[PDB]
Short mmCIF file of C-alpha atoms in Angstrom, two decimals:
data_model
loop_
_atom_site.label_atom_id
_atom_site.label_comp_id
_atom_site.label_asym_id
_atom_site.label_seq_id
_atom_site.Cartn_x
_atom_site.Cartn_y
_atom_site.Cartn_z
CA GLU A 1 169.74 131.32 -73.59
CA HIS A 2 166.76 132.33 -71.48
CA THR A 3 167.89 134.49 -68.57
CA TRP A 4 167.07 137.92 -67.30
CA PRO A 5 170.06 140.22 -66.49
CA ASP A 6 168.13 141.82 -63.72
CA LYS A 7 170.23 142.80 -60.61
CA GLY A 8 168.82 142.84 -56.99
CA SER A 9 168.22 140.88 -53.84
CA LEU A 10 165.09 138.83 -52.78
CA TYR A 11 164.85 137.99 -49.05
CA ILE A 12 162.21 135.28 -48.36
CA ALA A 13 161.16 134.38 -44.80
CA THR A 14 159.06 131.17 -44.55
CA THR A 15 158.30 128.01 -42.70
CA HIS A 16 159.51 124.31 -43.05
CA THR A 17 156.33 123.00 -44.65
CA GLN A 18 156.54 125.66 -47.29
CA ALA A 19 160.30 125.60 -47.90
CA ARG A 20 160.45 121.82 -48.05
CA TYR A 21 157.28 120.88 -49.90
CA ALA A 22 156.00 123.97 -51.78
CA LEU A 23 159.02 126.13 -52.45
CA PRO A 24 161.82 124.01 -53.94
CA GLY A 25 160.32 123.81 -57.43
CA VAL A 26 159.66 127.46 -57.55
CA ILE A 27 163.17 128.39 -56.33
CA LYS A 28 165.01 126.19 -58.74
CA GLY A 29 163.15 127.93 -61.65
CA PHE A 30 164.01 131.29 -60.23
CA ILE A 31 167.74 130.96 -59.57
CA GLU A 32 167.98 129.67 -63.09
CA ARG A 33 166.33 132.48 -64.94
CA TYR A 34 167.62 135.12 -62.62
CA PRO A 35 171.38 134.70 -62.21
CA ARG A 36 172.21 138.23 -61.11
CA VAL A 37 169.53 138.07 -58.31
CA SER A 38 170.84 137.29 -54.89
CA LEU A 39 168.19 134.92 -53.55
CA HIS A 40 168.13 134.67 -49.76
CA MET A 41 166.02 132.30 -47.55
CA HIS A 42 165.31 132.44 -43.86
CA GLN A 43 163.24 129.70 -42.16
CA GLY A 44 161.60 130.43 -38.83
CA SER A 45 158.37 130.76 -36.78
CA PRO A 46 155.23 132.58 -38.09
CA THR A 47 155.60 135.18 -35.29
CA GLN A 48 159.24 135.78 -36.39
CA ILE A 49 158.81 135.94 -40.19
CA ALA A 50 155.82 138.21 -39.93
CA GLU A 51 158.11 140.32 -37.59
CA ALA A 52 161.02 139.94 -39.93
CA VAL A 53 159.21 141.48 -42.89
CA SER A 54 157.79 144.09 -40.63
CA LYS A 55 161.25 144.75 -39.19
CA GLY A 56 162.40 145.07 -42.83
CA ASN A 57 164.93 142.20 -42.52
CA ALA A 58 162.90 140.34 -45.18
CA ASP A 59 161.08 141.23 -48.39
CA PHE A 60 158.44 138.56 -48.67
CA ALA A 61 156.61 136.28 -46.07
CA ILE A 62 155.25 132.88 -47.24
CA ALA A 63 153.17 131.27 -44.45
CA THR A 64 149.79 129.81 -44.00
CA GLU A 65 147.35 132.30 -42.57
CA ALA A 66 149.78 132.95 -39.65
CA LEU A 67 150.80 136.60 -40.11
CA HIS A 68 147.32 137.59 -39.01
CA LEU A 69 147.22 139.29 -36.17
CA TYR A 70 150.13 141.05 -37.82
CA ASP A 71 149.24 143.86 -40.28
CA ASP A 72 151.17 146.48 -42.23
CA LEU A 73 151.69 143.68 -44.73
CA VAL A 74 149.60 143.04 -47.75
CA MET A 75 148.34 139.40 -47.70
CA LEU A 76 147.70 137.58 -50.86
CA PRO A 77 146.15 134.11 -50.94
CA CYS A 78 148.33 131.59 -52.81
CA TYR A 79 146.68 128.23 -52.31
CA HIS A 80 144.58 126.06 -50.08
CA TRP A 81 145.79 122.77 -48.38
CA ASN A 82 144.45 120.25 -45.82
CA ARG A 83 145.66 117.56 -43.42
CA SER A 84 146.12 113.81 -43.76
CA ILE A 85 146.16 111.16 -41.06
CA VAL A 86 149.29 109.00 -41.10
CA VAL A 87 149.41 105.73 -39.22
CA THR A 88 151.26 102.43 -39.10
CA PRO A 89 149.56 99.83 -41.40
CA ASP A 90 148.76 97.76 -38.27
CA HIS A 91 146.58 100.60 -36.79
CA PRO A 92 142.82 100.43 -36.10
CA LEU A 93 142.44 103.62 -38.20
CA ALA A 94 143.83 101.71 -41.18
CA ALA A 95 141.18 98.99 -40.57
CA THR A 96 138.08 101.19 -39.93
CA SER A 97 137.44 103.39 -43.00
CA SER A 98 137.07 106.16 -43.50
CA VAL A 99 135.39 108.30 -40.82
CA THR A 100 135.14 110.54 -38.36
CA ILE A 101 136.76 113.13 -35.87
CA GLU A 102 135.13 111.49 -32.88
CA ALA A 103 137.01 108.25 -33.64
CA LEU A 104 140.30 110.08 -34.10
CA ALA A 105 140.16 111.81 -30.75
CA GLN A 106 140.32 108.31 -29.02
CA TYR A 107 143.97 108.16 -29.88
CA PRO A 108 147.23 109.89 -28.91
CA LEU A 109 147.97 112.52 -31.53
CA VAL A 110 151.34 113.44 -33.21
CA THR A 111 150.83 116.86 -34.93
CA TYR A 112 152.19 120.38 -35.46
CA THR A 113 152.82 122.61 -32.50
CA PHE A 114 150.76 125.66 -31.47
CA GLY A 115 150.84 128.70 -33.83
CA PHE A 116 152.61 126.80 -36.55
CA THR A 117 151.45 125.28 -39.89
CA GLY A 118 147.67 125.67 -39.42
CA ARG A 119 147.31 123.95 -36.04
CA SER A 120 144.73 126.58 -34.96
CA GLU A 121 142.25 124.63 -37.28
CA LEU A 122 143.17 121.46 -35.35
CA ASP A 123 142.75 122.30 -31.66
CA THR A 124 139.56 124.37 -32.46
CA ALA A 125 138.12 121.42 -34.55
CA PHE A 126 138.07 119.25 -31.41
CA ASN A 127 137.01 122.18 -29.22
CA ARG A 128 133.77 122.96 -31.24
CA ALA A 129 133.22 119.13 -31.33
CA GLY A 130 133.37 119.10 -27.62
CA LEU A 131 136.45 116.85 -27.54
CA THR A 132 139.68 117.02 -25.48
CA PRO A 133 142.34 115.24 -27.53
CA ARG A 134 145.37 113.63 -26.11
CA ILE A 135 148.42 115.26 -27.95
CA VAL A 136 151.63 113.39 -26.99
CA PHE A 137 153.75 115.19 -29.60
CA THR A 138 153.70 118.73 -30.91
CA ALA A 139 156.30 119.29 -33.57
CA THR A 140 157.10 121.79 -36.29
CA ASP A 141 157.54 119.44 -39.21
CA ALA A 142 156.12 116.24 -40.70
CA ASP A 143 159.57 114.69 -41.07
CA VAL A 144 159.83 114.10 -37.30
CA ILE A 145 156.17 113.40 -36.98
CA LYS A 146 156.30 110.53 -39.46
CA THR A 147 159.52 109.36 -37.89
CA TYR A 148 157.61 109.01 -34.52
CA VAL A 149 154.58 107.50 -35.97
CA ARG A 150 156.69 104.56 -37.05
CA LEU A 151 157.69 104.15 -33.39
CA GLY A 152 154.01 103.84 -32.49
CA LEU A 153 153.99 106.89 -30.29
CA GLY A 154 150.62 107.96 -31.61
CA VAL A 155 148.45 108.90 -34.59
CA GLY A 156 149.94 111.56 -36.98
CA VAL A 157 148.21 114.54 -38.54
CA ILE A 158 150.32 116.35 -41.05
CA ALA A 159 149.97 118.39 -44.28
CA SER A 160 148.91 116.26 -47.21
CA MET A 161 151.72 117.65 -49.31
CA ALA A 162 154.11 116.47 -46.66
CA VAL A 163 153.36 112.76 -47.26
CA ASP A 164 154.44 110.93 -50.39
CA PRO A 165 153.89 107.23 -51.36
CA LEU A 166 157.49 107.24 -52.83
CA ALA A 167 159.03 109.05 -49.95
CA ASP A 168 156.94 107.37 -47.18
CA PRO A 169 155.86 103.89 -48.50
CA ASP A 170 155.53 102.25 -45.03
CA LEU A 171 152.88 104.84 -43.86
CA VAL A 172 149.29 104.60 -44.59
CA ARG A 173 147.70 107.92 -45.65
CA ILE A 174 144.16 108.79 -44.71
CA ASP A 175 142.66 111.95 -46.07
CA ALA A 176 141.32 114.36 -43.30
CA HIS A 177 139.31 116.79 -45.31
CA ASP A 178 135.82 117.27 -44.10
CA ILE A 179 137.28 116.98 -40.59
CA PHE A 180 139.45 120.14 -40.50
CA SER A 181 138.96 123.37 -42.35
CA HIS A 182 141.37 123.92 -45.25
CA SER A 183 144.38 126.22 -44.39
CA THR A 184 145.32 129.12 -46.84
CA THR A 185 148.95 129.84 -47.61
CA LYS A 186 149.26 133.58 -48.06
CA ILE A 187 152.02 135.84 -49.33
CA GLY A 188 152.86 139.08 -47.52
CA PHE A 189 155.08 142.15 -47.91
CA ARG A 190 155.39 145.67 -46.79
CA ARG A 191 153.30 148.16 -48.78
CA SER A 192 156.41 150.34 -49.07
CA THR A 193 158.40 147.63 -50.80
CA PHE A 194 159.02 148.47 -54.47
CA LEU A 195 158.12 145.52 -56.52
CA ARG A 196 160.72 144.61 -58.99
CA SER A 197 159.82 142.66 -62.10
CA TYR A 198 161.49 139.52 -60.76
CA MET A 199 159.33 139.85 -57.66
CA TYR A 200 156.14 139.83 -59.64
CA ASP A 201 157.56 136.84 -61.69
CA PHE A 202 158.17 134.88 -58.41
CA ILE A 203 154.70 135.51 -57.03
CA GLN A 204 153.15 134.52 -60.27
CA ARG A 205 155.16 131.30 -60.50
CA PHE A 206 154.15 130.44 -56.88
CA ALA A 207 150.56 131.75 -57.36
CA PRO A 208 149.43 131.63 -60.96
CA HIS A 209 146.32 133.78 -60.23
CA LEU A 210 148.54 136.61 -58.85
CA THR A 211 149.51 138.35 -62.02
CA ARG A 212 150.82 141.94 -62.13
CA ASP A 213 147.42 143.38 -62.72
CA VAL A 214 145.99 141.32 -59.78
CA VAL A 215 148.93 142.03 -57.52
CA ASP A 216 148.76 145.82 -58.16
CA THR A 217 144.94 145.92 -57.63
CA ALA A 218 145.46 143.95 -54.39
CA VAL A 219 147.83 146.53 -53.08
CA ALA A 220 145.69 149.35 -54.16
CA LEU A 221 142.81 148.21 -51.99
CA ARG A 222 144.74 148.87 -48.77
CA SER A 223 142.97 146.06 -46.91
CA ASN A 224 143.86 142.36 -46.64
CA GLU A 225 140.19 141.63 -46.00
CA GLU A 226 139.21 143.13 -49.33
CA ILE A 227 141.91 141.16 -51.02
CA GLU A 228 140.31 137.88 -49.76
CA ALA A 229 136.99 139.03 -51.06
CA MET A 230 138.60 139.68 -54.46
CA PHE A 231 139.08 135.99 -54.92
CA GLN A 232 135.67 134.89 -53.63
CA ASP A 233 134.65 133.90 -57.28
CA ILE A 234 137.76 131.87 -58.13
CA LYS A 235 138.95 128.36 -57.02
CA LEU A 236 142.53 128.88 -55.61
CA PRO A 237 145.01 126.08 -56.25
CA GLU A 238 145.08 123.17 -53.72
CA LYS A 239 148.24 121.38 -52.59
CA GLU B 1 158.47 89.85 -20.20
CA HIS B 2 160.72 92.78 -19.38
CA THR B 3 158.58 95.78 -18.55
CA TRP B 4 158.39 98.09 -15.55
CA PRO B 5 154.87 98.78 -14.10
CA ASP B 6 155.89 102.30 -13.14
CA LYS B 7 153.19 104.94 -13.60
CA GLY B 8 153.81 108.63 -14.38
CA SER B 9 154.31 111.16 -17.23
CA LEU B 10 157.51 112.38 -18.88
CA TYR B 11 157.44 115.68 -20.68
CA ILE B 12 160.27 116.23 -23.05
CA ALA B 13 160.99 119.54 -24.75
CA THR B 14 163.69 119.43 -27.45
CA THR B 15 164.83 120.44 -30.89
CA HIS B 16 164.73 118.89 -34.39
CA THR B 17 168.30 117.83 -34.72
CA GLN B 18 167.88 116.05 -31.37
CA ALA B 19 164.40 114.58 -31.96
CA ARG B 20 165.13 113.33 -35.40
CA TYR B 21 168.75 112.09 -35.18
CA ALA B 22 169.57 111.48 -31.45
CA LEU B 23 166.29 110.66 -29.72
CA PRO B 24 164.41 108.12 -31.85
CA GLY B 25 166.47 105.09 -30.64
CA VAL B 26 166.21 106.13 -26.92
CA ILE B 27 162.55 106.76 -27.19
CA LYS B 28 161.57 103.46 -28.68
CA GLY B 29 163.44 101.70 -26.01
CA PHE B 30 161.68 103.70 -23.33
CA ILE B 31 158.10 103.34 -24.54
CA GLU B 32 158.71 99.51 -24.74
CA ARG B 33 160.01 99.07 -21.17
CA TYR B 34 157.76 101.65 -19.65
CA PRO B 35 154.17 100.99 -20.90
CA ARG B 36 152.36 102.91 -18.08
CA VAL B 37 154.45 105.94 -18.62
CA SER B 38 152.82 108.68 -20.61
CA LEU B 39 155.65 109.88 -22.80
CA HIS B 40 155.15 113.40 -24.20
CA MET B 41 157.35 115.23 -26.67
CA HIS B 42 157.31 118.97 -27.65
CA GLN B 43 159.67 120.31 -30.34
CA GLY B 44 160.54 123.98 -30.42
CA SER B 45 163.08 126.83 -30.10
CA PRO B 46 165.87 126.72 -27.56
CA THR B 47 164.49 129.91 -25.99
CA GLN B 48 161.09 128.25 -25.81
CA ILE B 49 162.16 124.86 -24.47
CA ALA B 50 164.31 126.39 -21.77
CA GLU B 51 161.39 128.61 -20.88
CA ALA B 52 159.00 125.59 -21.09
CA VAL B 53 160.87 123.59 -18.38
CA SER B 54 161.30 126.87 -16.47
CA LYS B 55 157.55 127.48 -16.84
CA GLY B 56 156.96 123.97 -15.66
CA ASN B 57 155.25 122.97 -18.86
CA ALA B 58 158.00 120.35 -19.39
CA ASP B 59 160.10 118.03 -17.24
CA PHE B 60 163.28 117.72 -19.21
CA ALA B 61 165.11 119.87 -21.82
CA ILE B 62 167.43 118.35 -24.41
CA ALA B 63 169.30 120.91 -26.41
CA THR B 64 172.83 121.78 -27.37
CA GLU B 65 174.35 124.40 -25.06
CA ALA B 66 171.38 126.70 -25.71
CA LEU B 67 169.65 126.94 -22.42
CA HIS B 68 172.58 129.04 -21.38
CA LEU B 69 171.66 132.28 -20.50
CA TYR B 70 168.94 130.38 -18.74
CA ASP B 71 169.15 127.81 -16.05
CA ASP B 72 167.75 127.93 -13.30
CA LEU B 73 167.75 124.29 -14.53
CA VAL B 74 170.53 121.81 -13.75
CA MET B 75 172.58 121.22 -16.94
CA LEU B 76 174.16 117.86 -17.58
CA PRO B 77 176.50 117.27 -20.61
CA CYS B 78 175.28 114.39 -22.66
CA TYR B 79 177.61 114.20 -25.70
CA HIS B 80 179.78 116.27 -28.17
CA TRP B 81 179.10 116.74 -31.82
CA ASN B 82 180.41 118.78 -34.84
CA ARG B 83 179.49 119.96 -38.24
CA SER B 84 180.01 118.61 -41.75
CA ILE B 85 180.11 120.37 -45.05
CA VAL B 86 177.63 119.06 -47.59
CA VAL B 87 177.98 119.91 -51.26
CA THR B 88 176.97 118.65 -54.72
CA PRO B 89 179.58 116.20 -56.17
CA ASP B 90 180.41 118.78 -58.88
CA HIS B 91 181.39 121.39 -56.33
CA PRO B 92 185.00 122.92 -56.10
CA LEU B 93 184.94 121.88 -52.34
CA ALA B 94 184.62 118.24 -53.53
CA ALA B 95 187.71 118.83 -55.75
CA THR B 96 190.06 120.65 -53.31
CA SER B 97 190.56 118.51 -50.24
CA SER B 98 190.47 118.86 -47.41
CA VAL B 99 191.00 122.24 -46.04
CA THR B 100 190.21 125.36 -44.53
CA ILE B 101 187.82 127.93 -43.19
CA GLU B 102 189.19 130.72 -45.34
CA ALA B 103 188.29 128.77 -48.48
CA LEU B 104 184.80 127.93 -47.21
CA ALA B 105 183.95 131.60 -46.67
CA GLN B 106 184.33 132.22 -50.42
CA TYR B 107 181.01 130.52 -51.04
CA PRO B 108 177.34 131.18 -50.17
CA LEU B 109 176.40 129.21 -47.02
CA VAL B 110 173.33 127.16 -46.21
CA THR B 111 173.27 126.53 -42.43
CA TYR B 112 171.29 126.56 -39.26
CA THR B 113 169.60 129.85 -38.10
CA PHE B 114 170.68 132.18 -35.25
CA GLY B 115 170.24 130.74 -31.71
CA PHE B 116 169.47 127.17 -32.91
CA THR B 117 171.58 124.02 -33.17
CA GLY B 118 174.99 125.43 -32.26
CA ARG B 119 175.20 128.14 -34.95
CA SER B 120 176.90 130.47 -32.27
CA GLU B 121 180.05 128.43 -32.94
CA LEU B 122 179.64 129.09 -36.64
CA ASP B 123 179.23 132.92 -36.97
CA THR B 124 181.92 133.47 -34.26
CA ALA B 125 184.33 131.15 -36.10
CA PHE B 126 184.31 133.49 -39.11
CA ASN B 127 184.26 136.53 -36.79
CA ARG B 128 187.52 135.63 -34.96
CA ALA B 129 188.96 134.61 -38.36
CA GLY B 130 188.19 138.14 -39.61
CA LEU B 131 185.78 136.85 -42.18
CA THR B 132 182.31 138.03 -43.21
CA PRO B 133 180.48 135.01 -44.83
CA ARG B 134 177.55 135.19 -47.36
CA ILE B 135 174.63 133.21 -45.76
CA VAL B 136 171.90 132.88 -48.31
CA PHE B 137 170.01 130.39 -46.24
CA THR B 138 169.36 130.13 -42.43
CA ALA B 139 167.30 127.07 -41.62
CA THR B 140 166.34 125.11 -38.47
CA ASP B 141 167.04 121.63 -39.84
CA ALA B 142 169.34 119.76 -42.14
CA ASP B 143 166.47 118.15 -44.10
CA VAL B 144 165.79 121.40 -45.91
CA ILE B 145 169.37 122.42 -45.90
CA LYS B 146 170.27 119.29 -47.86
CA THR B 147 167.28 119.77 -50.09
CA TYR B 148 168.49 123.30 -51.11
CA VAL B 149 172.15 122.17 -51.51
CA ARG B 150 170.91 119.88 -54.27
CA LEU B 151 169.41 123.01 -55.97
CA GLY B 152 172.85 124.50 -55.98
CA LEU B 153 171.82 127.50 -53.78
CA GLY B 154 174.98 127.35 -51.77
CA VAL B 155 177.34 125.23 -49.59
CA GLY B 156 175.70 123.42 -46.67
CA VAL B 157 176.91 123.17 -43.06
CA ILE B 158 175.00 120.76 -40.92
CA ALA B 159 175.31 118.35 -37.99
CA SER B 160 177.38 115.27 -38.90
CA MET B 161 174.75 112.99 -37.40
CA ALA B 162 172.24 114.69 -39.76
CA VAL B 163 173.98 113.33 -42.87
CA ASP B 164 173.97 109.71 -43.82
CA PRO B 165 175.39 107.89 -46.83
CA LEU B 166 172.34 105.67 -47.05
CA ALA B 167 169.86 108.50 -46.47
CA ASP B 168 171.83 111.07 -48.57
CA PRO B 169 173.83 109.25 -51.18
CA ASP B 170 174.04 112.11 -53.76
CA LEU B 171 175.61 114.52 -51.27
CA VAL B 172 179.30 114.59 -50.65
CA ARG B 173 180.19 114.85 -46.89
CA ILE B 174 183.24 116.83 -45.81
CA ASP B 175 184.19 116.85 -42.08
CA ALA B 176 184.41 120.21 -40.62
CA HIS B 177 186.06 119.51 -37.28
CA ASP B 178 189.20 121.61 -36.61
CA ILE B 179 187.25 124.43 -38.20
CA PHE B 180 184.39 124.84 -35.76
CA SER B 181 184.43 124.05 -32.00
CA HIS B 182 182.39 121.01 -30.92
CA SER B 183 178.91 121.60 -29.63
CA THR B 184 177.69 120.05 -26.38
CA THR B 185 174.21 118.57 -26.11
CA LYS B 186 173.17 119.08 -22.51
CA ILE B 187 170.17 117.85 -20.45
CA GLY B 188 168.26 120.29 -18.05
CA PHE B 189 165.54 120.06 -15.58
CA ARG B 190 164.22 122.04 -12.59
CA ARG B 191 166.01 121.42 -9.29
CA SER B 192 162.52 120.94 -7.66
CA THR B 193 161.61 118.10 -10.01
CA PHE B 194 161.32 114.78 -8.19
CA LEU B 195 163.37 112.33 -10.24
CA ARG B 196 161.49 109.07 -10.71
CA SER B 197 163.32 105.75 -11.39
CA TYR B 198 162.23 105.89 -15.12
CA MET B 199 163.69 109.43 -15.40
CA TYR B 200 167.08 108.18 -14.20
CA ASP B 201 166.70 105.26 -16.66
CA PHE B 202 166.07 107.62 -19.54
CA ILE B 203 169.00 109.95 -18.75
CA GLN B 204 171.33 106.91 -18.50
CA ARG B 205 170.18 105.54 -21.81
CA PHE B 206 170.67 108.77 -23.54
CA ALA B 207 173.92 109.67 -21.56
CA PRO B 208 175.71 106.47 -20.25
CA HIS B 209 178.01 108.47 -18.01
CA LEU B 210 175.03 109.99 -16.13
CA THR B 211 174.19 107.21 -13.72
CA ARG B 212 172.00 107.78 -10.59
CA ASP B 213 175.22 108.44 -8.46
CA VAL B 214 176.51 110.95 -11.09
CA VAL B 215 173.12 112.60 -11.56
CA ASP B 216 172.50 112.99 -7.80
CA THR B 217 176.03 114.39 -7.29
CA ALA B 218 175.48 116.81 -10.18
CA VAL B 219 172.25 118.18 -8.60
CA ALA B 220 173.96 118.42 -5.12
CA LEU B 221 176.62 120.88 -6.50
CA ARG B 222 173.99 123.56 -7.21
CA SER B 223 176.05 125.01 -10.06
CA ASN B 224 176.00 124.08 -13.78
CA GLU B 225 179.56 125.28 -14.08
CA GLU B 226 180.76 122.78 -11.45
CA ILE B 227 178.88 120.17 -13.17
CA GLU B 228 180.91 120.76 -16.34
CA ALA B 229 184.16 120.64 -14.30
CA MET B 230 183.03 117.27 -12.94
CA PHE B 231 183.53 115.70 -16.38
CA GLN B 232 186.87 117.32 -17.14
CA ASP B 233 188.59 113.96 -16.76
CA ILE B 234 186.32 111.99 -19.05
CA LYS B 235 185.75 111.73 -22.83
CA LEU B 236 182.05 112.34 -23.32
CA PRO B 237 180.43 110.37 -26.25
CA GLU B 238 180.56 111.94 -29.77
CA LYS B 239 177.80 111.87 -32.22
#
């Protein structure tokens, strides 16, 4: 009863964290209301997906602050998010509560790899705090990180949206905000790309503050920096 | 009571499929019996992990037939594995049973991305069969593939070890052997690398046929091709 007969394709290049935890709800709502739209998805590395949309092989790029050094795309902030410390219930971090970064760095870390899912805020957090942390596992997703935390390899640091009491009941969650800076998931696309009505609809469903007026104004500025400054007066969503 | 006091580090660079489905059991058994061994893990792309061990940043490389244009590493076959078709219970493929590749190519596919987890046997399977398949999702892991199969995006093709009746009960498994060729998980390392006793132990636990005598003989041949021919008379394990 409520479908748009709009025809066209939508190529989305993104990461695991986004495609697994942030995107599923938005996509189900899209494929329902847009039957004649051929929705494509292509998961890969931040360097690849930023290249992909720049190569033209993709329409949109959904990643967290990672398509910067890249340019030629217009970047729009979607939401903020932060990390959480995951440990076995029998861990000293479950006992001591609930501080600091200096205490965390006394343990082997299981986290995201370099240049993927806001790890740049992790390694530089210890760096400025004059600490050299022992990282015994660099992964690309929390699914394996949590899996190896159970083994007792080391302490896990993942996206907070990537942990769930129902999904992961045997793992103790410890919020790691005020330890690492928040990471911003941004949406990017070539300035040449003609924005169909279903594209605006998708952006708006994934980022409520990014309406047609806001999106068009953001493109008109011709500077990703000025786009960020446009939302200095509004609290972006936080996942 | 049963631990080796051996000291040293072991850097392992691998993929998701391996680290999530094939490695956890071996890893737990290792960290137990080797307490003084600093076990490291680094998940990434086949091009990176083959480069990583070649760069020296890693000791071993565990991936499926993917460090081959590389190597420049000594490759040792560990086991074979094949794909499985995952669909919603209300899918035409659940009804019709249990045939072919020509029927599969009439549906949107959700599979692994190019150059990752034996997808080269997928795209070339349709290619030789004169088919151009519609791939609406290229991922790097089955966790998201299965997640989007539930959405009804398209038909999923993942590693058979990556699906489990207990883990994924709402997804119908259809074996896809005799459609695609089997993929071989191989283990690689620099010829210069001095092989500690715990390294032999790890290889043997992950690949029972790769004992110290077999491993040493494999290195002595100085050719990955001749290594493959060494196991032409034995059925490798199949996961």
